[PDB]
Amino acid sequence: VAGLNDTHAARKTGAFQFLCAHGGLAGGVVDKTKNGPADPDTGAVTVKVAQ
Amino acid sequence: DALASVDGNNAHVEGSRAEDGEMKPTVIKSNVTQILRKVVRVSDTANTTA
Numbered sequence: 001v002a003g004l005n006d007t008h009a010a011r012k013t014g015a016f017q018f019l020c021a022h023g024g025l026a027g028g029v030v031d032k033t034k035n036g037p038a039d040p041d042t043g044a045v046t047v048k049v050a051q
Numbered sequence: 052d053a054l055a056s057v058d059g060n061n062a063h064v065e066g067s068r069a070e071d072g073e074m075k076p077t078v079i080k081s082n083v084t085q086i087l088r089k090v091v092r093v094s095d096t097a098n099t100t101a
Contacts, residue, residue: 005072 021047052077 021036036047
């Protein structure tokens, strides 16, 4: 990556959804349809979708 | 991060603009440890003799 002074691309911060158990991306933004991955330890799923 | 090579031709004009950037890396020197082992197994019988 060295050598490029300012030709680099912008940066983005992990939003509320990215930092959570999103379980997939729909491009530049988290997907709002696929439920998050089940916690391996517990049986929890914190990212759901309204039925 | 030692200095750069001397520029014997560091001659410029009086009304010139600066040149491109000088992006240099952050080269690091590293090493790893080494495990030295010395095993010795002697029967208990041999430990009782004189």
